Design a protein around this ligand. Structure first.
Ligand code: MN
Ligand code: MN
Length: 402
């Protein structure tokens, strides 16, 4: 194995400009072809990311340069941008492709709530009406505050969603028995396996308490889809190669091919702490770490907050030298994203964009820019490095790094 360890960090949603097929995707009816997460942030609120620029962020080919991220004539790493092949721009699709799958049946998202077929089906199975005013994207903690009292009186189901392909059912334990909530969720899981209702995850959300003061209970159950084919995580795990997960990674893959889940992040910074700790483990002598830093997407992209997005990027850039200081000489660091989420754009959804790829190792004997590639080339490079099979798609760029 050329690199003894590889650390892949996903800056969730950090796109670097509309993809060739961007107009096949949209935001509140507006096609994605004008989106440009990094570029639009830079030209509106500014963007100071000297540590990523030094690796070569400003060397990645673009029609027009990042306004405030200059090219670097003496870069320390290799950079390029990667194009998504899968027909979805959601988080699960992007990560699964980064690990080598080609998703041609993209998960459905429901900005206007679940269709009548799904709701009507669940209503008939459960014998309970669904509260239609709650069938829409909704803070899980606010929907319970808003319709909890009603549910306590009527026993109606509260079914809601998020920006993700997720269906959640909140049900007060006093009026809706756990056993029943689970059966309903299982039935729900069974009728959402194909488009136009393909759901990544069904979540039972039991809760207790009283009006204006509710508490979610540990009786939560999840019903998630695993990758439909072995990914490079499976290839590594099957070969006895360690796979460490940080952040949303375990959830996204439903644990498939993950030997060491380090758990959810409290925040990006707490995630970077956890990655640094993981890198320092005496047991972690060989293998792969896979970290998702989600704040860019959840707090800033979806909320169309460019100022905050900028700050979040700056704060990651400030911590990047800590990650690098913790690398062994024969470690490789890869930084990328899973789609865009342009905070200057119409809508409040992800945007179909190229994603940056930054590559760094102290053992590098060269630097510069790689040919533009595809998401799954990341998986193939990792597979190549550890001498395991590729999954569905992807081509290694390992030979360019050595
Ligand atoms: Mn994402
Ligand atoms: Mn998102």
């Amino acid at each position: 194995s050329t690199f003894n360890r590889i650390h892949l960090v996903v800056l969730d949603s950090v796109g670097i400009g509309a993809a060739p097929d961007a107009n096949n995707f949209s935001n509140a009816g507006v096609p994605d072809g004008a989106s440009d997460t990094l570029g639009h942030i830079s030209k509106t609120v500014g963007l100071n990311v000297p540590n990523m620029a030094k690796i070569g962020l400003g060397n990645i080919p673009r029609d027009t340069p990042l306004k405030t991220v200059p090219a670097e004539n003496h870069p320390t790493g290799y950079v390029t941008k990667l194009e998504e092949v899968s027909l979805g721009k959601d988080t699960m699709t992007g990560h699964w492709e980064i690990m080598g799958l080609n998703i041609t049946e993209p998960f459905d998202t429901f900005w206007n709530g679940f269709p009548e077929e799904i709701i009507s089906k669940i209503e008939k199975f459960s014998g309970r009406k669904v509260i239609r005013e709650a069938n829409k994207p909704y803070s899980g903690t606010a929907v319970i505050d808003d319709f909890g009292p009603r549910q306590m009186e009527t026993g109606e189901l509260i079914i809601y969603t998020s920006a993700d392909p997720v269906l959640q059912i909140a049900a007060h334990e006093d009026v809706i028995p756990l056993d029943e909530l689970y059966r309903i969720c299982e039935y729900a899981r069974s009728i959402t396996l194909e488009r136009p209702a393909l759901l990544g995850r069904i979540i039972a959300r039991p809760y207790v308490g009283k009006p204006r003061n509710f508490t979610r209970t540990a009786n939560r159950h999840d019903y998630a889809l695993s990758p439909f084919a072995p990914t490079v995580l499976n290839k590594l795990a099957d070969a006895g190669v360690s796979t460490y997960a940080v952040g949303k990674i375990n959830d996204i893959f439903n644990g498939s091919g993950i030997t060491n889940d380090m758990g959810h992040n409290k925040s990006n910074s707490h995630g970077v702490d956890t990655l640094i700790k993981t890198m320092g483990l005496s047991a972690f002598t060989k293998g792969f770490s896979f970290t998702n830093l989600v704040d860019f997407d959840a707090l800033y992209g979806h909320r169309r907050n460019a100022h905050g997005y900028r700050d979040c990027l700056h704060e990651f850039d400030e911590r990047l030298p800590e990650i690098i200081a913790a690398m062994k000489v024969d470690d490789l660091l890869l930084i990328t994203a899973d789609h865009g989420n342009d905070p200057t754009y119409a809508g409040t959804d992800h945007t179909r964009e190229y994603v940056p790829l930054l590559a760094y190792s102290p053992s590098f004997t060269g630097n510069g820019v790689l040919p533009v590639g595809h998401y799954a080339d990341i998986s193939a490079t990792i597979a190549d490095n550890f001498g395991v099979d590729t999954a569905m798609i992807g081509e290694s760029f390992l030979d360019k790094l050595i």
